[PDB]
Amino acid sequence: SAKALIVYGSTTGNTEYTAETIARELADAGYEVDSRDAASVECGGLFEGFDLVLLGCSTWGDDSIELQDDFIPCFDSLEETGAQGRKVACFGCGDSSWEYFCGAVDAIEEKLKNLGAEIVQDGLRIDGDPRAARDDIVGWAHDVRGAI
Numbered sequence: 001s002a003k004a005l006i007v008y009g010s011t012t013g014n015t016e017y018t019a020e021t022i023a024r025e026l027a028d029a030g031y032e033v034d035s036r037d038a039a040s041v042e043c044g045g046l047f048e049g050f051d052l053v054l055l056g057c058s059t060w061g062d063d064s065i066e067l068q069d070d071f072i073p074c075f076d077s078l079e080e081t082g083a084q085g086r087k088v089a090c091f092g093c094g095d096s097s098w099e100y101f102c103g104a105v106d107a108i109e110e111k112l113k114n115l116g117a118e119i120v121q122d123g124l125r126i127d128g129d130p131r132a133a134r135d136d137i138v139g140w141a142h143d144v145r146g147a148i
């Protein structure tokens with residue numbers, strides 16, 4: 001039960017760094033971690049074979065909440081990923097200047113719940129430079145593991 005998948009959408013590298021930091025925490029704890037940029041993934045059956053799935057996505061949109069571009073395809077086809085009964089947790093980078101702070105996390109969590117996933121922890125929301133939030137990221141990964 002030690003297979004973890006991380007799929008992230010990141011344009012300026014912040015959610016990518018966050019994914020790398022989570023991946024190391026899980027691997028140190030004994031998980032076999034498969035980290036993938038959402039740009040590279042196929043949506044059909046994406047979660048197959050994984051005991052834990054972590055989804056990272058930054059938030060965009062001129063005057064609406066939009067997901068990072070590379071994440072949109074598998075969000076649109078999230079019902080084909082194998083999320084039913086899957087343990088999942090979400091993370092994302094954003095900027096609290098925006099009212100809908102890390103709103104992509106809300107959109108992904110709400111759809112996952114409809115699709116029957118088990119959300120193992122409330123999503124991690126990072127403001128600004130994620131390197132300045134490293135302790136929060138490591139602690140969240142620790143807490144996700146402890147809620148399995």
Ligand SMILES: Cc1cc2nc3c(=O)[nH]c(=O)nc-3n(C[C@H](O)[C@H](O)[C@H](O)COP(=O)(O)O)c2cc1C
Nearest residue numbers: 010011012013014015058059061094095098101102
């Ligand atoms: C047009 C635009 C819209 C944005 N909208 C939001 C937003 O609604 N909520 C939020 O938290 N951050 C918003 N941001 C901030 C980005 O999510 C932030 O730059 C983040 O660090 C990017 O993460 P990434 O490098 O992983 O893509 C917006 C940024 C831009 C340029």
